[PDB]
Amino acid sequence: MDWVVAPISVPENGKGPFPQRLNQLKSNKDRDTKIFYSITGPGADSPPEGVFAVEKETGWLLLNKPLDREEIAKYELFGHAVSENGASVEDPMNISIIVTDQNDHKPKFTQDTFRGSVLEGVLPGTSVMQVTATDEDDAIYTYNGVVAYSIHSQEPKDPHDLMFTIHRSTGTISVISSGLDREKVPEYTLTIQATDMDGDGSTTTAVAVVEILD
Amino acid sequence: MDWVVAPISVPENGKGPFPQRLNQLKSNKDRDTKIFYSITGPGADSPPEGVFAVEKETGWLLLNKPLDREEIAKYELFGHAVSENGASVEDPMNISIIVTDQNDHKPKFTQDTFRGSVLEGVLPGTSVMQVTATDEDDAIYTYNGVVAYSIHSQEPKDPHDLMFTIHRSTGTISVISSGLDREKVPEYTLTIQATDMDGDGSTTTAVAVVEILD
Ligand SMILES: Cc1[nH]c2ccc(-c3ccccc3)cc2c1CCN
Ligand SMILES: Cc1[nH]c2ccc(-c3ccccc3)cc2c1CCN
Ligand SMILES: [Ca+2]
Ligand SMILES: [Ca+2]
Ligand SMILES: [Ca+2]
Ligand SMILES: [Ca+2]
Incomplete structure (x- = not known):
């Protein structure tokens, strides 16, 4: 039992230090090879680059800078799971970041x-x-x-x-x-x-x- | 591929009309009977009673009032899959609501x-x-x-x-x-x-x- 879609709602103009963790990715089958994660998309590997990032090993999705919802109000990223042997294990998972308003x-x-x-x-x-x-x-x-x-x-x-x-x-x-x-x-x-x-x-x-x- | 944990981040003192749909439940056992969804925990059936609720035949998790974070900043609820015979199907899923601050x-x-x-x-x-x-x-x-x-x-x-x-x-x-x-x-x-x-x-x-x- 799980959510149909799981967006991540992230308040804009946030504080503390960065990076910040948001949610953690995990793939169904990670006792097969070791699993290396990767994110892609506008806000990851296309402009604006380097706003979001994933921890290769742990799967944590990270926020690098504060977001201005009044500039971009939502991102659409993709999660990638690749074994240590080079194999795309699952399908790239839809990652949706909703920027909420301050x-x-x-x-x-x-x-x-x-x-x-x-x-x-x-x-x-x-x-x-x-x-x-x-x-x-x-x-x-x-x-x-x-x-x-x-x-x-x-x-x-x-x-x-x-x-x-x-x-x-x-x-x-x-x-x-x-x-x-x-x-x-x-x-x-x-x-x-x-x-x-x-x-x-x-x-x-x-x-x-x-x-x-x- | 999924998140190890998907909390719902809900801006406090929200506008628009209520109820408001937050996410939708679904059980990877629904291609069988017609499942019917319920909801428990403080904020649902404990005090304060009735801040959240779920449509029994859709799984949509609804928010009934605008939230005040300074009154309560987090909720841990549970969602329930039953068929027409009150039969608990899989275990209850945990719902974690994280009231973000305005x-x-x-x-x-x-x-x-x-x-x-x-x-x-x-x-x-x-x-x-x-x-x-x-x-x-x-x-x-x-x-x-x-x-x-x-x-x-x-x-x-x-x-x-x-x-x-x-x-x-x-x-x-x-x-x-x-x-x-x-x-x-x-x-x-x-x-x-x-x-x-x-x-x-x-x-x-x-x-x-x-x-x-x-
Ligand atoms: C309670 C609540 N707060 C929100 C804040 C932002 C967006 C939102 C959804 C899609 C695109 C852009 C924004 C949706 C919500 C909801 C659910 C109410 N349909
Ligand atoms: C506005 C805002 N953003 C957050 C982002 C993350 C967590 C958070 C919740 C549980 C464990 C660790 C962190 C809490 C918050 C809040 C509420 C501030 N009391
Ligand atoms: Ca930005
Ligand atoms: Ca309240
Ligand atoms: Ca203030
Ligand atoms: Ca406040």
Whole structure:
């Protein structure tokens, strides 16, 4: 009884010293001759070379350097078993290395300044613009690339203080208080923020400048 | 050819929807009857009950909740092959789950205010005190719980702007400049900071109060 496929899930940007052992190969029939192991493939004997390596005698698969999942996210290697007489004993076994995500990219805003506009008498609830930011990290399986949006401050304060909201996850700045007037205040400037791990991580700052129109 | 041991490495505090498929069991006795798969061990039928489960007619090993490594960092379970007559077929296979760590804990100083002191006439380089922050994440195999120390600000900014420094990894504050004097400034108040992922992570802040002596 065994696994149908056995991938090796390896957290990226890892520490300690290298090499590191990952799993150990063994062939069914190694009381026949002595067995010498070898790995091949992209990440072993093709570029990037020398990222993975196997111990000839012991069969330990080794990690040589830390992996950036944000560069290569999975490898496909092959295990080779060759007796001391030169005989390929088994078929090269599929070795699959899945690189899992650490939170090693701060979220970075689309543009340094975002510019949008709206009109004096729009009903509370009304879209005005959408900002964004990208986090190069993963957002399907981890929260490391999932972004939360917020508004820090609003200048000028004038008719109110919470003049706008931004949707936490889509980045849509709405107006929420009727009371706009282009003559009294023509150009608000929102100081906005993107925060990875869904608000519990790093925070990048940028600005959105809403102009109110006649 | 196979691994002598295939643990499953599962990033903690995972996203997406659950359950989640991890690997699939299979018995090299299934070209016979229709086998039915079950699962035992702490995390399965012991406390905490129900974190893993396997689809009886597929063998897929499912994860029901997101894991917290700092709550439990490893699981040893057993999978079971039975036919329609509850008949144990081969022995139970061992399932080893290795919860890999994410940066889900901000660094916490041990006290809000460290108190130290040093004589006015000590030489530049002279140690003074050593502050400390602890991060619950792994600092062995990952940077998530590796702290980096820094002085935010010193007040009063008398005589020089920066009279002290701190070891980035050890927490030891030392004197970097000449000119302490109890008569002129008898105490300095150092805003200290601790940042995880060895600097590129989350921060909290404390203060170290250094008294100058005759
Ligand atoms: C619980 C968990 N964490 C993962 C992290 C990464 C990949 C993964 C699989 C194939 C290619 C690339 C990545 C799969 C998983 C799963 C199983 C959920 N289908
Ligand atoms: C994040 C991470 N990566 C690993 C890689 C390997 C082993 C490991 C498990 C059993 C024996 C020897 C080593 C443990 C870990 C952890 C959890 C850190 N408490
Ligand atoms: Ca790499
Ligand atoms: Ca748990
Ligand atoms: Ca941490
Ligand atoms: Ca953690």
